Amino acid sequence: MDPREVILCKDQDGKIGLRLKSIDNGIFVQLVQANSPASLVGLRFGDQVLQINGENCAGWSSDKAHKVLKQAFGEKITMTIRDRPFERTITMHKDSTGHVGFIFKNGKITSIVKDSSAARNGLLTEHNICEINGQNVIGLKDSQIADILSTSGTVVTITIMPAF
Amino acid sequence: DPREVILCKDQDGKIGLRLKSIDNGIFVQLVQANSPASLVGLRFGDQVLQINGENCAGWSSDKAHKVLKQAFGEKITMTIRDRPFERTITMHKDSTGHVGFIFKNGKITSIVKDSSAARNGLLTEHNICEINGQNVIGLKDSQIADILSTSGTVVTITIMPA
Ligand SMILES: CC(C)[C@H](NC(=O)CSc1ccc(Cl)cc1)C(=O)O
């Protein structure tokens, strides 16, 4: 909730590696490209953008935010950021079959299995998986998320966020 | 961390709770003033994990309400997660006494350009839960405006997605 400032420099192709999305008259980070200027200043999926070059993003369309970034004079772009403000952590325990009890697609939880640790702990659907046991899984394929869950110990801590 | 709470039904057999199904969970939509619910610390936005040791996962609002109504005895147990969607934003009134938002039915509907609300990233389609620690769930819009108009310069609002 406490804002922080980041300075980006456009790469060789003139890009910062960011897709922004207008939600509820705010601006949120929808995509950070691996190894991008955005990635290197710590921008993450679900970050809220309060200011671009000291101008308020309030009520901006996705297009406007993107036009402002594209037209930005010179190499140096400032953003005022709230770090993943809607991020929440839930702890589950694997059952005798090694399952916590949820289905997901494209890193979004789609159903909760009856009588599972996910059910007991009130895990929610229409939430994106951000981290498993402190490991960032944004941008991983579903099979890679399953690989991490399958190799986990009994305790599974998942960081979630309401989906875009 | 969830907590377990014990409610004793009032003289009418009620706990003073309205529940809502969201994202295959169950959430507190209303806590009646001075109700058994109120007295064990339940608030708008609390998540209900268990009622009498049964998982609420995937229950309709109706089912949660039927289970509460059918509960035999003086004593109802719930497992509660404290307001997991709760977000607090601090704003400062401008020279005209405004923070810079419009709301309707306790729900923020627009952010005024160049306002404290704009600078602080206040969001629309969010319900106002508290103003400076005071609960405003169930208040009429004009009563919410009265509280904002009476506030000091510092306005801390607790919001939640609608
Ligand atoms: C992986 C765990 C979350 C496990 N759940 C599932 O296997 C169903 S979800 C899934 C979806 C796409 C792929 Cl590629 C792999 C798994 C559990 O409930 O513990």
Ligand SMILES: CC(C)[C@H](NC(=O)CSc1ccc(Cl)cc1)C(=O)O
């Ligand atoms: C009330 C505050 C939030 C103030 N905002 C407004 O005057 C516009 S919103 C409003 C809606 C319904 C009623 Cl009945 C009264 C006011 C501000 O921007 O500080």
